[PDB]
């Protein structure tokens, strides 16, 4: 069904920044549309006052995955939301394993 409640939609950079800063919880992430690359999502986690943005796009093979630095190995998935459950692995996902979702609906 692809249920993405963490996708508030399209918001400016200033919006995503204050959005994660409001929660005041390290590890808080959100799903916002890329204001530079259409059809591509962006998962941001607030850490050290700096909002770390990560581009998430589906490969031509149909597998879901995120961008990887030149020299790092990235695993492939079969769902957009599945990326969250797989990224919840400490020292095996991102700067911080997603923990507190910041959706625009209910607190």
């Amino acid at each position: 069904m692809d249920a993405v409640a963490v996708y508030h939609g399209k918001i400016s950079r200033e919006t995503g920044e204050k959005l994660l800063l409001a929660t005041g919880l390290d590890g808080s992430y959100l799903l916002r549309d890329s204001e530079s690359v259409p059809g591509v999502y962006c998962l941001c986690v607030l850490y050290h006052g700096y909002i770390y943005t990560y581009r998430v796009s589906q490969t031509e093979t149909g597998s879901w995955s995120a961008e990887t630095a030149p020299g790092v190995h990235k695993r492939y998935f079969r769902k957009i939301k599945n990326l969250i459950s797989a990224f919840q692995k400490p020292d095996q996902g991102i700067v911080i394993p997603l923990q507190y979702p910041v959706e625009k609906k209910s607190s």
Binding site: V72, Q92, G93
Partner: peptide
């Protein structure tokens, strides 16, 4: 300062 975004990539 005046910039709360890194736009980095996954280092893991």
């Amino acid at each position: 300062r005046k910039s709360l975004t890194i736009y980095a990539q996954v280092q893991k």
